[PDB]
Design a protein around this ligand. Structure first.
Ligand SMILES: Nc1nc2c(ncn2[C@@H]2O[C@H](COP(=O)(O)OP(=O)(O)OP(=O)(O)O)[C@@H](O)[C@H]2O)c(=O)[nH]1
Ligand SMILES: Nc1nc2c(ncn2[C@@H]2O[C@H](COP(=O)(O)OP(=O)(O)OP(=O)(O)O)[C@@H](O)[C@H]2O)c(=O)[nH]1
Ligand SMILES: Nc1nc2c(ncn2[C@@H]2O[C@H](COP(=O)(O)OP(=O)(O)O)[C@@H](O)[C@H]2O)c(=O)[nH]1
Ligand SMILES: [Mg+2]
Ligand SMILES: [Mg+2]
Lengths: 230, 439, 430, 95, 41, 439
């Protein structure tokens, strides 16, 4: 508890322009909780990955802080993060000695979520494709003309996996660990089950695959938040 | 690209269409005024309402149905009701005078001058549609205008269209509780008219519906409104496969084969479960295994005939909710192992399992609570023999002295129609017995 | 270089397809967007086998999705991994099949065959040297068995030399999902014998038995069944994309798995499988791998290989293992399981070696074996027709397509003796 | 909103629901009173908005939170927030 | 070979279970007018 | 996964049934509201509520109980009582007319119009249960409804399920403090029904409880609430082992194989200790030394039968608290040393031992305070023959010349049946006399 509850100070946000380097939190807008990490508990994984937990308490703690370090050199040398610009979740240097990265693997009958039964999200030390992520605007219609646009702190944020294209969200499922009671974290697509006749859209050509025609519910809603004061 | 045009005729048809359309509109989220909230039009191009709705291009959503009736009372109520602005102000055709429980009247005298408009309207409605999958017709057999226009419309559509599949959700007379006294006639004649011109029919008798509500929902004084609501639930369950994605999908064409080994006599017996009220809802598990078992209990049956009397030919299961597919197959095993239901010797495999994800939707003012699973019952067995004979016996008893006949003879009907039709009724009281029985 | 093509049809055939490309996309290190991000330089050398080069450096699968109902194909593209397939390659009508084998072969399915035959020919012509077609579909479904087979039938009239595969999910009598389940499969089956070079039969019961028993899972979803079948797919061509000590293309297996020209129906199995709660408690190495793979229950066919004798069998070990251990276990299994590697063909087991283990596991194998034990499946499954044929009918839903009786009485005359061909090559001895 | 007669209409459907659920030989007021006496546990005779909503859902009359609040305020003239079901059931019996 | 097939001649005999819509297999023997039905592939 | 279905029928059982559940409710922390908040425990603990409660998926627990009685008077108070929100709304079967303390009415005419619902409820109840270990039924024998419906219900189960063991707690008339005037008639005919149908019977005569209440509790004006409290303890006393950790768990299946040497001799009497109030307890020591010694005190037995008047045939004991097992052996050994308590010649080992750690739970406001130890003594002895004899003596005098016979005769029960009862009841007695003879 001591180290985990060690002092943490979230960095300020200027002009609401969250930029790589500012120690930020990850909240669940619909689940009203903040993503929390654990180093003690060990997942059933031969590699070194560690479980994650979403916590209702919003008091700031180091274990709930991550780092947004540029994932790959790109044309966007200016520091403002752009939609669809690759980036990685980085853990605070205080939680663990070795740099820890959150990662997820594909569906598998052998590899499956402990509770949700979906693709699990892993806090491991792997250094491959499995680290990338890219923001995407909440409004379904704007999904197209947001490419390359600035992201503003305080605006709702969804998450999807570039290696697999699954959204990281939270659901009302209980979980057990030392740090009291908590919910689980996993990646999935809670797409509105209603179907859209996309086939005829192409041949008739009224529409293109790029603009999505399937509503995405709230349970995937995440909103980046900065510290209260500078 | 897939749509189904719903055709309604008669008092019962009009009311059932009203309830079912309320259910469909609420389930798809279209507000009563016909204008979707301006926050969920992302899929407006394709969406799912195309199955029952055809966008006007400016926002309004037109139901793909037509209402016909010769009595202005019900048609007037629809216009003055809270759904006034939804239906098209010409597709609810209005009659002039009532048929008054005379199947002869509604088929050769008062309906000739109006059937013409129905054909034109239906053709115009179908023209906009692109992938017509089938037609649904709800009608009240024991009602004059219902059977008459109901029969004439089906006969005309036969020649007009041909191979298009179409299902008949009739409302046959109750076994002992009665509303009309001449129901045996207008019931019998309609039978022949539908027999060789409709491909599939399902019984929806009343008393069976009434008891189901009393036993489960605990409403000792139910009105017709409670009756119509369940029927809408059955329609939604049957059609949900066409508008909600699922692992196992059943289309209207998936029925003419999987349950129809023969063309001429097309009949069914259905049931529903669960039907649970709030006061008795949260306190129970509502497991998939138990729900399916409750389905085959004769007490919950939706027609006044105990299925145990004979042999089951085929049965189609359509689930909606959070059913785990592995659970579905296990459940069927228990049904087959139970010795209380014995399949007609030939059934080799007459189960068609349908799995859909979207849960049933609850409408305000209804009796059903909120549930996470459901099962639909559509299976025909030799048990549909009681319904036909029982109607017939009354026919002979009341025809043995030429009673009530003159109401028919002087309206244009020849005398030979009755003689010929009853021969079809004999041709139906000597059908479901050859395999009802080491041959 | 010796690339192949895939034609998957029917909702059943489509759903399996939906994951295989999911499975394949991982092995070559490709995510949904169609961009390369792999790790190992060997990952990309043999990539041309399943993808075609495209502008912008992006790759697209060489796949043709074929269906007669609109919902299925509308379903896939809007879901995860929905961007890989070329939009043009899609083909669909406005009618549907409705598990009516008649409608899917004469009236509706017949009229649209032009497009699918139009698209299939073009893609095959593009490849430098077409290795062969692999056809996946469900004979229990309408479009797959009914219209899907014809494409299998027709394509033979244009490409006599290339070899075929079929991952057909034949339905089992225990739990039938359709009453028609037993007038669409066989009528597609009968046409299958004269054209299909090889046949893989995957029985649903095996999947549920496979999932519940070994995986120790509680509430599986079709996503569980699909992937396990898909994993088998990677085994067939696994050695076709990575270097190894002992390689064997899909041709080489064909030579050493079919004892006689027409007896081309196999049973397959995938190992090793263990539950989430059991991984640590098991020491995974070469010799206990054989125990799982040769176990009858591991088979995906409802038939029990203990009901008969094995004619020929092949196994593709996955994972980097030496050459000595692979052979020796074969000698013991042959001698110990001699009673079944029946007796007139010595050492009827083929061996393969590949050095790319499935990501996240250090040893696994794929099984493709021929054993008369398949005879039961073509004897019992729907065996009721022989008694249920006598009464002549259900016809009115199938003569609506011009089908006559002679097309049926003739089939057993052509079809009477599969086991009467398989049975004979089970008691014979020198 | 819900100021206009829509509140009265909701009462009409509600009265129908208890009328359908009413047992023979007893008025609707007793049927509504028994449900209120079933839901309440303090036995004081006053229930909160949550209890009123639970009673409505049991009868099958489920509406949005705004409508439930409006109905409660319509009969809660004092604005204290603890409506008395003794008068609430009596009004239904009169109607 | 062996395998299976369909039946496909309906409007033939038994004169009653003919075209009785109800998945009723093919038709009804009634040669003796007694029990077992025709026991789709 | 180990669950037992409880059956309650009749006025006598209902209140004793009422007492058992509350303590059962208390022991798990499920407040009458239907929740188990605990120390905010959600998934962070074992699953022990299976033995007597079932999970509904989200929230509350539904007890595995079915209630039967022909007079709605008793059911109503429970339905509107302090636990109104716990029991299933419809599983509380309610009758229409009182059994009027006549067996013939309760077994042949009015009792045959309600059993159908009972079996239907039970059959569905067993479906949810997966590890059914047996049945526990509470009933009264001195009442027409009690013996009648209870007997018929038990008979129905005998064929429906068969090998499933049954344990029933009845309440026979007191030797002299007795209320009913026709109670003996119903009892004997009840004995025939359960003689060859039930497995383990636990005598629970009422008068014995009074002395236990008065003498030890030092209460001179006990009420029906007090007596019910003791019974609930024993009922919770006997089965508590199956659901909590213990040194040597003992399953309900391990009574027919350890307490009934012969098939017909299956009637057994109970006793409880220690018994101490909330005033004079902390100054007393309560050691395994004397607590076991008091349990064998004849005056402390839970039934009005002197164990000093017959040999001991087989015994079974369960310990709870912090008892060190070796302390268990020491207490037993001296008991054998004492010559007052004597066993039969053919039982070499006659002590079955079991230890469960959990301390008995205290329901505030009662008579028994929080002690750290206790023991339940359940033993079958040949001395119970007297009680059956005493009832027989009552029957002969009141049946010599047809006392109140016509009331029973007119309902349909044959006159010769009583001759059947006398034959069976006396036959059992003569069976017991032979068993006690020495080899
Ligand atoms: N279950 C149910 N049955 C209805 C309903 N409305 C009408 N019916 C049936 O209709 C019968 C009464 O005659 P109708 O068929 O309604 O008469 P109609 O269709 O208006 O024909 P006409 O009276 O000649 O104009 C009753 O016996 C009912 O079975 C309804 O809302 N629910
Ligand atoms: N100790 C005890 N005995 C009871 C209780 N209730 C009923 N009895 C027994 O029941 C016998 C009389 O039967 P009733 O009072 O009529 O109850 P019943 O057995 O359900 O018979 P019915 O009134 O017809 O329902 C008495 O002699 C009691 O021994 C109780 O609460 N405690
Ligand atoms: N293993 C497996 N079987 C499937 C899947 N989808 C469908 N099936 C099987 O396919 C059968 C139905 O096929 P059908 O719908 O008639 O094929 P279609 O006519 O092309 O749509 C069912 O019995 C299922 O067992 C799947 O994703 N996995
Ligand atoms: Mg009318
Ligand atoms: Mg009583």
């Amino acid at each position: 508890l001591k180290r985990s509850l060690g002092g943490v100070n979230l960095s300020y946000a200027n002009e609401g322009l969250v930029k790589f380097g500012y120690t930020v939190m990850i909240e669940s807008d619909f689940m009203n909780a903040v993503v929390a990490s654990n180093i003690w508990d060990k997942i059933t994984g031969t590699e070194e990955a560690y479980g994650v937990t979403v916590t209702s308490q919003k008091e700031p703690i180091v274990r709930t802080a991550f780092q947004l370090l540029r994932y790959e050199q790109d044309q966007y040398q200016d520091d403002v993060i752009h939609y669809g610009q690759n980036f990685k979740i980085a853990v605070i240097s205080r939680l663990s000695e070795k740099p820890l990265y959150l990662t997820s693997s594909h569906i598998t009958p052998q590899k499956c979520a402990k509770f949700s039964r979906k693709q699990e999200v892993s806090i491991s030390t792997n250094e491959g494709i499995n680290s990338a992520w890219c923001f995407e605007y909440m409004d379904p219609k704007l999904r197209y003309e947001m490419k390359g646009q600035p992201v503003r702190s305080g605006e709702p944020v969804l998450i999807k996996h570039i290696p697999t294209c699954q959204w990281l969200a939270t659901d009302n499922v209980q979980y057990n660990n030392e740090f009291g009671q908590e919910f689980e974290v996993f990646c999935n697509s809670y797409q509105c089950h209603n179907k859209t006749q996309n086939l005829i859209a192409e041949k008739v050509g009224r529409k293109t695959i790029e603009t999505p025609m399937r509503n995405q519910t709230n349970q995937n809603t995440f909103r980046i938040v900065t510290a209260l004061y500078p | 690209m897939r749509e189904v045009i719903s055709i309604h005729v008669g008092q019962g048809g009009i009311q059932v269409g009203n309830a079912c359309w309320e259910l469909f509109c609420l389930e798809h989220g279209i507000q009563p005024d016909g204008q979707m909230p301006s926050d969920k039009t992302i899929g407006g191009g394709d969406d799912a309402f195309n199955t029952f709705f055809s966008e006007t291009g400016a926002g309004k959503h037109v139901p793909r149905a037509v209402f016909l009736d010769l009595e202005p009372t019900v048609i007037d109520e629809v216009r003055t009701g809270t759904y006034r602005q939804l239906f098209h102000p010409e597709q609810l055709i209005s009659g002039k005078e009532d048929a008054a429980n005379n199947f002869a009247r509604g088929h050769y005298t008062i309906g000739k001058e109006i059937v013409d408009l129905c054909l034109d309207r239906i053709r115009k409605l179908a023209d906009n549609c692109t992938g017509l999958q089938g037609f649904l017709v709800f009608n009240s057999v024991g009602g004059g205008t219902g059977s008459g226009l109901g029969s004439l419309l089906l006969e005309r559509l036969s020649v007009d269209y041909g191979k298009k599949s179409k299902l008949g959700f009739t409302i046959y007379p109750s076994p002992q509780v009665s509303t009309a006294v001449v129901e045996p006639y207008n019931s019998i004649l309609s039978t022949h008219s539908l027999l060789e011109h409709t491909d599939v029919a399902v019984m929806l008798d009343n008393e069976a519906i009434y008891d189901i509500c009393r036993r489960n929902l605990d409403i000792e004084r139910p009105t017709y409104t409670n009756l119509n609501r369940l029927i809408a639930q059955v329609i939604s369950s049957l059609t949900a496969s066409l508008r909600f994605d699922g692992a196992l999908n059943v289309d209207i064409t998936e029925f003419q084969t999987n349950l129809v080994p023969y063309p001429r006599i097309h009949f069914m017996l259905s049931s529903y479960a669960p039907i649970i009220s709030a006061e008795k809802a949260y306190h129970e598990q509502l497991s998939v295994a138990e729900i399916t078992n409750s389905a085959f209990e004769p007490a919950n049956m939706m027609a006044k005939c105990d299925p145990r009397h004979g042999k089951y030919m085929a049965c189609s299961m359509m689930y909606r909710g959070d059913v785990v597919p592995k659970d579905v197959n296990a459940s069927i095993a228990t049904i087959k192992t139970k010795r209380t239901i014995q399949f007609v010797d030939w059934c080799p495999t007459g189960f068609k399992v349908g799995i859909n994800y979207q849960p049933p939707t609850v409408v305000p003012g209804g009796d059903l609570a909120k549930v996470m699973r459901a099962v639909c019952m559509i299976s025909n067995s030799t048990a549909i023999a009681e319904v036909f004979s029982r109607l017939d016996h009354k026919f002979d008893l009341m025809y043995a002295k030429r009673a009530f006949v003159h109401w028919y003879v002087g309206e244009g009907m020849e005398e030979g129609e009755f003689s010929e039709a009853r021969e079809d009724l004999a041709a139906l009281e000597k059908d479901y017995e050859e395999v009802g029985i080491e041959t | 270089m010796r690339e192949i093509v895939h034609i998957q049809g029917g909702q059943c055939g489509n759903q399996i397809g939906a994951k295989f490309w999911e499975v394949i996309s991982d092995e070559h290190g490709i995510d949904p967007t169609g961009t390369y991000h792999g790790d190992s330089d060997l990952q990309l050398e043999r990539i041309n086998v399943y993808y075609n080069e495209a502008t912008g450096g992006r790759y697209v699968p060489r796949a043709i999705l074929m269906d007669l109902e609109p919902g299925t194909m509308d379903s896939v593209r809007a879901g995860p991994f929905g961007q890989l397939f070329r939009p043009d390659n899609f083909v669909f009508g406005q009618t549907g099949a409705g598990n009516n084998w008649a409608k899917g072969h004469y009236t509706e399915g017949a009229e649209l065959i032009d497009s699918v035959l139009d698209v299939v020919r073009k893609e095959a012509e593009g490849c430098d040297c077409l290795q062969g077609f692999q056809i996946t579909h469900s004979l229990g479904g309408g479009t797959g068995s009914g219209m899907g087979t014809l494409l299998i039938s027709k394509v033979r009239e244009e490409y006599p030399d290339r070899i075929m595969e079929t991952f057909s999910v034949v339905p089992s009598p225990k739990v039938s999902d359709t009453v028609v389940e037993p007038y669409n499969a066989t009528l597609s089956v009968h046409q299958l014998v004269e054209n299909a070079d090889e046949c893989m039969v995957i029985d649903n019961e095996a999947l549920y038995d496979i999932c519940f028993r070994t995986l120790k899972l509680t509430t599986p979803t079709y996503g569980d069944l699909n992937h396990l079948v898909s994993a088998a797919m990677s085994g067939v061509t696994c050695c076709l994309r990575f270097p190894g000590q002992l390689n064997s293309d899909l041709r080489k297996l064909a030579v050493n798995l079919i004892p006689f020209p027409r007896l081309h129906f196999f049973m397959i199995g995938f190992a090793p499988l263990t539950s989430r709660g059991s991984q640590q408690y098991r020491a995974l190495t070469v010799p206990e791998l054989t125990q799982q793979m040769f176990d009858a229950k591991n088979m995906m066919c409802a038939a029990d290989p203990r009901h008969g004798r094995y004619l020929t069998a092949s196994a593709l070990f996955r994972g980097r293992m030496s050459t000595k251990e692979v052979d020796e276990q074969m000698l013991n299994v042959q001698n110990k399981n001699s009673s079944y590697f029946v007796e007139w063909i010595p050492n009827n087991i083929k061996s393969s070696i590949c050095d790319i283990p499935p990501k996240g596991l250090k040893m696994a194998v794929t099984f493709v074996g021929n054993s008369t034990a398949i005879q039961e499946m073509f004897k019992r499954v729907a065996e009721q027709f022989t008694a249920m044929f006598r009464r002549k009918a259900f016809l009115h839903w199938y003569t609506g397509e011009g089908m006559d009786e002679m097309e049926f009485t003739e089939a057993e005359s052509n079809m009477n003796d599969l086991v009467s061909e398989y049975q004979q090559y089970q008691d014979a001895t020198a | 909103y819900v100021s206009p007669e829509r509140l009265n209409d909701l009462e009409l459907i509600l009265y129908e629901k208890i009328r359908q659920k009413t047992l023979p030989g007893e008025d609707e007021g007793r049927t509504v009173y028994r449900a209120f006496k079933y839901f309440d546990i303090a036995e004081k005779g006053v229930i909160d908005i949550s209890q009123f909503k639970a009673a409505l859902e049991k009868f099958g009359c489920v509406f949005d939170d705004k409508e439930i609040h409006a109905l409660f305020s319509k009969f809660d003239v004092n604005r204290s927030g603890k409506i008395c079901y003794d008068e609430f059931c009596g009004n239904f019996a009169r109607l | 070979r062996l395998q299976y097939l369909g039946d496909k001649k309906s409007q033939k005999s038994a004169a009653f279970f003919r075209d009785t819509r109800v998945s009723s297999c093919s038709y009804i023997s009634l040669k003796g007018g007694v029990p077992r039905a025709i026991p789709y592939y």
